[PDB]
Amino acid sequence: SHMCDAFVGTWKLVSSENFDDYMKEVGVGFATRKVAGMAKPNMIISVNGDVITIKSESTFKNTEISFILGQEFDEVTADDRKVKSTITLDGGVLVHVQKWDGKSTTIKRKREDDKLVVECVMKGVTSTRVYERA
Ligand SMILES: Cc1ccc(S(=O)(=O)NC(=O)N[C@@H]2C[C@H]3C[C@@H]2[C@@H]2CCC[C@H]32)cc1
Structure with a gap:
């Protein structure tokens, strides 16, 4: 057993707060915000050795991203940003930092009760999204 066992599995979005405002702060345009905000993703997290894979499936x-903790990678986000990402485990929280164009956003994922809580932060704006097991 290991590092991310309590994250592994298939998760479905059950609630969201402030996500449109977070996307505005990131610079996502109107049409992408509307369609991405309407998405109800399933997040599938798996581990094979040192490699963690996070898939997000929605309409x-x-x-899909695969990575090793602490080891930077290039990512194309669903909103079509080309970012440099690093994901670490900090006190049991997965911390995903994305850098692009001199900007930075952080996505934190943590287990709380039977939920996987996703917190997206861009400057002063936070969005909290709650997933439950599928
Ligand atoms: C389509 C969709 C998938 C997952 C979420 S999430 O907020 O639940 N998980 C993320 O991984 N968020 C990231 C914060 C930026 C990047 C990614 C998400 C894609 C659109 C812009 C946000 C929200 C929407």
């Missing part, structure tokens, strides 16, 4: 986009 808007299907994305």
Whole structure:
């Protein structure tokens, strides 16, 4: 057993707050915000050795990233940003930092009760999204 066991599995979005405002702060345009905000993704998290894979499946986009903790990678986000990402585990929280164009946003994922809580932060704006097991 290991590092991310309590994250592994298939998760479905159950609630969202402030996500449109977070996307505005990131610079996402109107049409993408509307369709991405309407998405109800399933997030599939798996681990094979040191490699973690996070898939997000929705009617808007299907994305997949694989990474090793602490080891930067290039990512194309669902909103079509080309970012440099680093994901670490900090006190049991997965911390995903994306850098692009001199900007930075952080996505934190943590287990709380039977939920996986996703917090997206861009400057002063936070969005909180709650997933439950599928
Ligand atoms: C389509 C969709 C998939 C997942 C979420 S999420 O907010 O639940 N998880 C993320 O991983 N968020 C990231 C914060 C930026 C990047 C990614 C998300 C894609 C659109 C812009 C946000 C929200 C929408």
